[PDB]
Amino acid sequence: RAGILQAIAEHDRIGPEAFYFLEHEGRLYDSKAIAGVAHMYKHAVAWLRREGFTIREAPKTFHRRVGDVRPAALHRPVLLLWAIGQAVARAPRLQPWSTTRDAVAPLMEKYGQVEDGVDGVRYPFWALVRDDLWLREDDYNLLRSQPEAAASAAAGLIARYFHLLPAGLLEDFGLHELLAGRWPDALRPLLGETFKDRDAIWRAYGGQKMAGIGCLADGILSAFSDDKGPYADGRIPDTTWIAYVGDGLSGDQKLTDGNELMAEHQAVGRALRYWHKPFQGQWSFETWAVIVQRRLRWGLGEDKLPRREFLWVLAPVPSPERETWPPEVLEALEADTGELHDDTGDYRPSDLALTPGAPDGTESDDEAYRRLAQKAEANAERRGQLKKPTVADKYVRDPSARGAVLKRCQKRCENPECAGHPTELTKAGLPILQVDHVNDLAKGGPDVPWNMIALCPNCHALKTYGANKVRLQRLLAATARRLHEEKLQ
Amino acid sequence: TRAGILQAIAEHDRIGPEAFRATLEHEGRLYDSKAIAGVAHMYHAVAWLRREGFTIREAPKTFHRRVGDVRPAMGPALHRPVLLLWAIGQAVARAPRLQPWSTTRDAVAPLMEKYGQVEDGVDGVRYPFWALVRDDLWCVEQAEELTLTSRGRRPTLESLNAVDPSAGLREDDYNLLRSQPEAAASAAAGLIARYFHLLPAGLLEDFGLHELLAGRWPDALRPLLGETFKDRDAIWRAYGGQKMAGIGCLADGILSAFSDDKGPYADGRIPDTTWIAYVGDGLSGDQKLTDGNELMAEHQAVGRALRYWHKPFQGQWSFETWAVIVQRRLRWGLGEDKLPRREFLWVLAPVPSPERETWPPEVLEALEADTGELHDDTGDYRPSDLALTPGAPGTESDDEAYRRLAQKAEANAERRGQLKKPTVADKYVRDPSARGAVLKRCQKRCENPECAGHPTELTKAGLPILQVDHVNDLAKGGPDVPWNMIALCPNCHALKTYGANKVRLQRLLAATARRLHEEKLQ
Ligand SMILES: [Zn+2]
Ligand SMILES: [Zn+2]
């Protein structure tokens, strides 16, 4: 297929009209089109590179380039934001150094927290040229023609750098009449946009397919949750908050890549996009959310081996704007402290259900247990003396107590009136049971084994919406305490 | 007194409200009624001013609300919003608040012809030029001089061209728009949402709203997706409307449907999909296309979206999605008087925004196929047959006149099977008649012959702790008929869906479903 040299020669002889780019002898040629004409002489790019040709990328969209403006740093975005405000107000494209300086230098002092604003303008006045933003022709015309793009770009810059939006930002800059009601309204995707593949998302907004946690073309963080099986979404029960597992595939996860970015977002209290694919369903950007707590937990990697993993507790919010965030969220930060809450202690990989064992090492009896129940009590007492308890403190479930109930019940219903239940396991190899509190956490009940009970689907239904739910609750409360106390002597 | 009062009003204008406080609706400007009466005299009182022919007012509802009250009474009620939209465009571009009829006429009349689908645009402007006054949005200066139509609500063309009266927006409204662009963008978006939802190229300019709304028009609309409220009252405080299930319209005049989950084992969402099955309006007897249902039908015809509120069980309300009416059906259900009744089933498809460009192809295809006509499923089944009607039964029917139900299920199933382009509604909405049949067959018991055991206790709502479920999933082409369905307890259902021996069980259930079905035919 090197005969494409003949196709290139005809592109030269007749012109672009008649004939991702392909570079040959200092000239650019449409990759797909050259491949097609060569055929007569979607895996095209590979074919051309397999022949000895260097393939170059198309010029990055204005949205992408303004999105690439990231810290290694408020200088660049301040200038950019001024430039957008200028273009929207029909100011001239090119302006002299002299006016830009003493027009932006006050902004640079007040919003870019730099001392010498005059000097502050010098850096981005030059550095922004090698960011392919310094405005350009096509960019200036884009902003003058399509105000959505101006509003989007400014919203992107405002989201990442000035998420707290201090009063007098929109004017002082040129942007008050443009951003108006709400600044992040111009951001895309819209809440509820649906995509089949992860690739489809990528095509539309960029970033990469790799990783749960990553930034889209706009430079705003995005976290992706894929439901593995049915009866298992990220949502922590009795609430609308998410328990999002962290970034590292296969071994003990670290504050690198996605987890790192999450931590950077946690510290400053910046929101992020939360994507979600229900089981047998499509992806969708379903909510903005804010890091409210981070913890460490035992889980399994892709190598099926136990591992330390991060648990990012996310709180959904209507938009990035902090004024729009409900008070439960705003209370959960500041209470956060931004520090890792660790797992081990009360919590051995089994302990909990996803690691089968005999137990082959007879070190621990199944009736320890007692170790789990103790940790559950300790943790419970410590939560019980929280003056202002966040919804996370209240509803996130202690692994140790769940573990204890599992060790106690041994794949059976603990309801002594059980009509009967199957001993078949699930596809994933767990019993068809659920551990549930007799006295709901929502109504003050404690997160401890003697307040919990293992139930088959049928008995669980009885407990939850059965006609005699109340009497059953009494019975279950009794038998839970009983079963608990039987394992202490 | 009347001309005395006019002279008093004229001096209030000359000097200003501050200097009047230093020393009643007329202009489109409000005047302190006691104070105006007093200056009229010596240079209640209320009775005197109303005696002389002046409209005496309370503090008008918010501009948002009043523009939202602009509602219709192939159908021509685009006059008022066309004028209003022009006026907002004018105010944003710093034009004068009051403008002569002459200019407004031949500035708006082309807009009226192009966007208001009226023939004579020049004549089209007359109606809202006057009618908008009594909507508390407009004012016309020397009104008394005009001669009205025989009918009431149009000044005649001759009288308008003669006097050339300076008319416009109200005072405070004009200042609101001139000061706060969010309010302009909101009002315009409202009008564009209800009229012109299919936003044609390019009305934003022509109207002088391009710079304000070009990016996306509905961005200025509130509430935002995901706003959460405790009560229905909390919603009402923030956005108006009434505490009616709805449709109800909020203050902005945009339709809003509210779904409140009754117990824990249901939401509106039709299974296997994200589309909603929303029960109509009208609390108690056979529902009619009146109130909310009427509005839903108007929205269905033109393919206009609407706000869908939802409160999960033991949870809070939230505006969770925009949605579009994709199909409407008639079904048997129970009213608030606990009695069987004919009710509407509005099949909603969620969408990201009101803009049609943003809607996915499944939605577009389903709308394309709709026909907008009522599908009456009420003939296929009886209120007996629904699980919420407790009964002996008969003597109309033995319980093995289940045969009746199964027959209707077949007939419907065959008719769906021959659909060339089947919408996701056609495929996934579940036939009551077949469900009913399974319920009459199983009689409050698990049909899985290997059932480990299940309780005979009922739910709080008085239904057995079971579920009817297809052995061959509809999603995988299985038919919506009783011999393809099976009644399972929670345990057996879990076994079916994610048990380790799911596959073998499916074969067993398929077999026993056919068997049980065929036992009732002989
Ligand atoms: Zn049980
Ligand atoms: Zn069963």
Numbering used by the authors:
A (entry chain D): 8 to 26, 38 to 59, 77 to 107, 114 to 175, 206 to 560
B (entry chain C): 7 to 29, 40 to 59, 78 to 107, 111 to 430, 432 to 560
Can you provide the manuscript's text about this entry?
The Type-IV restriction endonuclease (REase)ScoA3McrA (abbreviated as ScoMcrA hereafter) catalyzes multiple double strand cleavages 16–28 nucleotides (nt) away from the phosphorothioate linkage with the core sequence GPSGCC/GPSGCC. The DNA PT-dependent REase ScoMcrA distinguishes PT-DNA from normal DNA which differs only by one oxygen-to-sulfur swap, and presumably encodes a domain to specifically recognize sulfur on PT-DNA. Each ScoMcrA protomer consists of a head domain, an uncharacterized domain, a SRA-like domain, and an HNH domain. The uncharacterized domain binds specifically to PT-DNA whose sulfur atom is in the Rp but not in the Sp configuration, therefore we named it sulfur-binding domain (SBD).
In each asymmetric unit, there are six ScoMcrA molecules, which are assembled into three dimers. Superimposition of the six ScoMcrA protomers in the asymmetric unit shows that the head domain exhibits substantial positional variance with respect to the other domains, suggesting that it is rather flexibly attached to the rest of the molecule. In the HNH domain, two β-strands and an α-helix harbor the active site residues H508, N522, and H531, that are critical for its endonuclease activity. Four cysteine residues, C484, C489, C527, and C530, coordinate a Zn2+ ion in a zinc finger-like structure. A domain sandwiched between the SBD and the HNH domain in ScoMcrA structure has an overall structure similar to classical SRA, but does not possess the NKR finger and thumb features. A comparison of ScoMcrA-SBD structures in the free and PT-DNA bound states revealed that PT-DNA binding induces a rotation of the side-chain of Y164 in the sulfur-binding cavity of ScoMcrA-SBD. When not in complex with PT-DNA, Y164 is flexible and samples a variety of conformations. Of the six ScoMcrA molecules in the asymmetric unit, only two have clearly observable electron densities for the side-chain of Y164 and both of which are in the closed states. In these two molecules, the hydrophobic phenyl ring of the side-chain of Y164 covers the opening of the non-polar sulfur-binding cavity.
